[PDB]
Design a protein around this ligand. Structure first.
Ligand SMILES: Cc1nc(N)c2cccc(C(=O)Nc3cc[nH]n3)c2n1
Length: 844
């Protein structure tokens, strides 16, 4: 069909990479996964209620927090229903269904309740107190404005039609290293490794030969592992040294069909620069003219080789219990491993032991793996226990190459409601990088979830698209997942994603084109190019990628400008394209090149997770984790937090480009911007909370020592950090930033105390203690973040920072003292560090 031979060109420009291309593949695993995904996709489309899918209610089965209950007049929430112009207020109880909120308007004085100014529907059988939009209304002191209208037509979604034994040969596995060769450049040798989940099962090498643009060996490298002991997910890892590593490449020793890898191979190798997820890829370097390659041979006879509790002492029990207790990063000695293994059935009654128990497995032994599978059939406790995301994330990291282990963690995620899937989506997507195969329970889980809900589906799209555009190591695998998702979301979203891509691609060339001049001469062209695009180029509107609910209209040209950073970002403003928009505020997006916005994404995501850990304890630490979409390499968009200034600019205003930071200023600015002393005391309350929130979160993440220009505040007291790639993204110390100008708002002056400051410490202590209950979760997310998104900064010693910060092993009281001491390094230091940042960041 020419229709579905044009559709493929659409998907291709939507993905940013061509899936059908078969030039950089040495097998049919991708075709196999593309085909492989047809069933889970079609199963999901056929399974979704077309109406609830069309309206995508943003719901939560979580209890309504205290800070929102303690902000209720009397079991009464007010909604304002709009039509023509005619407003109308109804007396509604939190437990009121939105279906019954109409039987309180069609009788109390068919259709659907849509939020004013956004594509957000209050539909289905949920208590209204459970709609995400209702909770944010209660939080920010805002009236709930609904506009009655027609439900979208489900028919708008609708998708376009479609239609011997390895355990029987005891031979030592071997690889023939024919030789290497590099288009253009010493001593050089191949190192060959048989790996499984970062566990090296064997090591062999070749003889150091002279480094010539062509180096041959024709050697057979016999390993000490039997053909019959090779576990599925095992990688032949080939590497080149000289001693320093130069290039690597991997090859699954067992394919997607369970066949021992036989034949001839020429593999284009990945270069190094300057541990991480890129070193794990089964993908080869597409760049042929430049890459080093390697030629090998694997035995190829006949011959398809296919792959098919008692008592316990006391000091041992207590030794075992101490192992299960230890954090995810604490290492296991052979003694610990042999212990976990011997008492495996007793280790099975503790879900918390699974990562350590599965890590104590000798995967290079057929019989052992076989018994581990015996163990997996006795999974009742794991299956029954309450789902633990931190524990679940652990079995999906780089340390576990076995599909059956990985799949039990995916089985545990199936019971996550949409709300929670969004909290962990970015990291589940990054977790695909640790999958030995392109087709996994996780890749299908991501797919099943995207296809069932447009919010998860929208973000799943941008997340995959971000990776396809800047990761050559994982783009193929990611392009196959995106294509699977796009062939089932519906033509509605299909067309909708098309609008989005056109706009953002248009605005990126502009970003790059304006960047080419590093002035009044600049201010000129920017307004010229935005005049061009506004005609028959960018269509009427488009969804805001970081906020799927908002549709952005035309460019309010007058407000758009190039900003003053070494990298010249664009400050763009859009009219809301929705007439029902209660207001006339624009949509502010920053477009930039030079910031590894991938890093901000991972950080902002953990920031949303800490806001959620604080909710389990009725704490609102007022963080502003702004929308942020990475669109490629060192490029993307940033949501503009309205009514906000940089702390340094508030200083540069009444001291100006100096360092003579007056402790008086911030409080002057806050009073300057407050219309009443009522609003001033809220702007002070929001400050204490916001400051405490960032102080802890920042400290825990090891991004506490920040420059003055990289901390912002709203005219309403909300402080917040920015530019998360600018630190460990390109990196005397302060633990976090708690300067004298902040402290002066709180009431204190240098070495004193005030009510707000004690409130400050009591929030900080609570907040800091509240996260320590999720030590394991945070350690794993922090760990996964460094492997998948922090190029260079791994070491493992960078990871182990979080252990120290989270003061693991320490009891509560010892942990409260440690934090208060950290608040003291701040008190002691005052302006020392900020001053060095000016001395460093503004002058050298
Ligand atoms: C999040 C936010 N909001 C602003 N109002 C803003 C205003 C000026 C500059 C930046 C900014 O540079 N943010 C970032 C974040 C990552 N890179 N740059 C801003 N970021």
């Amino acid at each position: 069909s020419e229709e579905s031979q044009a559709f493929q060109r659409q998907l291709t420009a939507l993905i940013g990479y061509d899936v059908t291309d078969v030039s950089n593949v040495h097998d049919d695993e991708l075709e196999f996964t593309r085909r492989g995904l047809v069933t889970p996709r079609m199963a999901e489309v056929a399974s979704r209620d077309p109406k609830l899918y069309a309206m995508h209610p943003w719901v939560t089965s979580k209890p309504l927090p205290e800070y929102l209950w303690k902000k209720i007049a009397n079991n009464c929430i007010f909604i304002v229903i709009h039509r023509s112009t005619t407003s109308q207020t109804i007396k509604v109880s939190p437990d009121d269904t939105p279906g019954a909120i109409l039987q309180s308007f069609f009788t109390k004085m068919d259709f659907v309740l849509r939020v004013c100014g956004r594509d957000e529907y209050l539909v289905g059988e949920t208590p209204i107190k459970n709609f995400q939009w209702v909770r944010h209304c209660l939080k920010n002191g805002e009236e709930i404005h609904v506009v009655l209208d027609t439900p979208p037509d489900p028919a708008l979604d609708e998708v376009r039609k479609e239609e011997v034994s390895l355990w029987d040969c005891d031979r030592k596995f071997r690889v023939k290293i024919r030789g290497i060769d590099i288009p253009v450049l010493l001593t050089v040798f191949v190192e060959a490794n048989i790996q499984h989940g970062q566990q090296v099962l064997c090591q062999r090498r070749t003889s150091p030969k002279p480094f010539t643009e062509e180096v041959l060996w024709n050697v057979w490298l016999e390993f000490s592992i039997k053909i019959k002991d090779l576990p599925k997910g095992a990688l032949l890892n080939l590497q080149i040294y000289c001693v320093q590593l130069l290039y690597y490449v991997n090859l699954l020793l067992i394919d997607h069909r369970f066949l021992l890898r036989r034949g001839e191979y020429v593999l284009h190798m990945w270069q190094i620069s300057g541990f991480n997820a890129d070193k794990l890829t089964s993908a080869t370097n597409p760049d042929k003219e430049n890459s080093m390659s390697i030629s090998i041979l694997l035995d190829n006879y006949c011959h398809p080789i296919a792959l098919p509790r008692a008592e316990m002492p006391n000091q041992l029990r207590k030794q075992l219990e101490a192992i299960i207790a230890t954090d995810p990063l604490n290492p296991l000695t052979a003694e610990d491993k042999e212990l976990l293994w011997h008492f495996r059935y007793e280790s099975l009654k503790h879900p918390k032991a699974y990562p350590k128990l599965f890590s104590s497995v000798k995967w290079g032994q057929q019989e052992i793996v076989a018994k581990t599978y015996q163990l997996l059939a006795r999974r009742e406790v794991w299956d029954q226990s309450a789902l633990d995301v931190g524990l679940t994330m652990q079995l999906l990291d780089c340390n576990f190459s076995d599909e059956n282990v990985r799949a039990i963690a995916v089985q545990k995620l199936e019971s996550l409601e949409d709300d929670d899937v969004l909290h962990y989506l970015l990291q589940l997507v990054q977790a695909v990088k640790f999958e030995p195969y392109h087709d996994s329970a996780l890749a299908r889980f991501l797919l099943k979830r995207g296809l069932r809900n447009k919010r998860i589906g929208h973000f799943l799209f941008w997340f995959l698209r971000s990776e396809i555009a800047q990761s050559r190591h994982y783009q193929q695998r990611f392009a196959v997942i995106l294509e699977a998702y796009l062939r089932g979301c519906g033509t509605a979203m299909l067309h909708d994603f098309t609008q989005q891509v056109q706009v953002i691609e248009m605005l990126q060339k502009v970003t790059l084109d304006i960047k080419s001049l590093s002035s009044s001469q600049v201010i000129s062209q920017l307004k010229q190019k935005l005049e061009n695009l506004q005609n028959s180029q960018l269509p009427e509107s488009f969804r805001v990628p970081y906020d799927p609910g908002l549709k952005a209209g035309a460019l309010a040209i007058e407000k758009c400008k190039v900003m003053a950073s070494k990298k010249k970002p664009l400050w763009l403003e859009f009219k809301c394209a929705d007439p029902t928009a209660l207001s006339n505020e624009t949509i502010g997006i920053i477009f930039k090149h030079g910031d590894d916005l991938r890093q901000d994404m991972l950080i902002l995501q953990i920031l949303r997770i800490m806001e959620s850990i604080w909710e389990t304890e009725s704490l609102d630490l007022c963080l502003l984790p702004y929308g942020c979409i990475s669109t490629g390499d060192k490029i993307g968009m940033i949501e503009i937090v309205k009514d906000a200034t940089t702390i340094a600019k508030i200083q540069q205003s009444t001291v100006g480009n100096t360092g003579a930071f007056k402790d008086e200023v911030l409080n002057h600015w806050l009073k300057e911007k407050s219309p009443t002393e009522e609003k001033f005391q809220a702007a002070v309350e929001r400050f204490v909370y916001s400051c405490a929130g960032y102080c802890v979160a920042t400290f825990v993440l090891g991004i506490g020592d920040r420059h003055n220009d990289n901390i912002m505040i709203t005219e309403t007291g909300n402080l917040f950090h920015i530019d998360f790639g600018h630190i460990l993204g390109n990196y005397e110390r302060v633990p976090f930033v708690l300067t004298p100008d902040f402290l002066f708002v709180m009431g204190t002056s240098g070495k004193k105390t005030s009510p707000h400051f004690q409130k400050f410490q009591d929030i900080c202590v609570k907040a800091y203690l509240a996260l320590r209950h999720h030590t394991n979760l945070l350690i794993i997310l922090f760990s996964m973040m460094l492997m998948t998104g922090m190029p260079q900064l791994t070491s493992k010693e960078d990871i182990e920072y979080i252990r120290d910060a989270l003061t693991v092993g320490k009891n509560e009281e010892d942990a409260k003292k440690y934090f208060l001491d950290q608040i003291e390094v701040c008190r002691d230091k005052g302006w020392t560090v900020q001053f060095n940042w000016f001395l460093h960041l503004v002058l050298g």
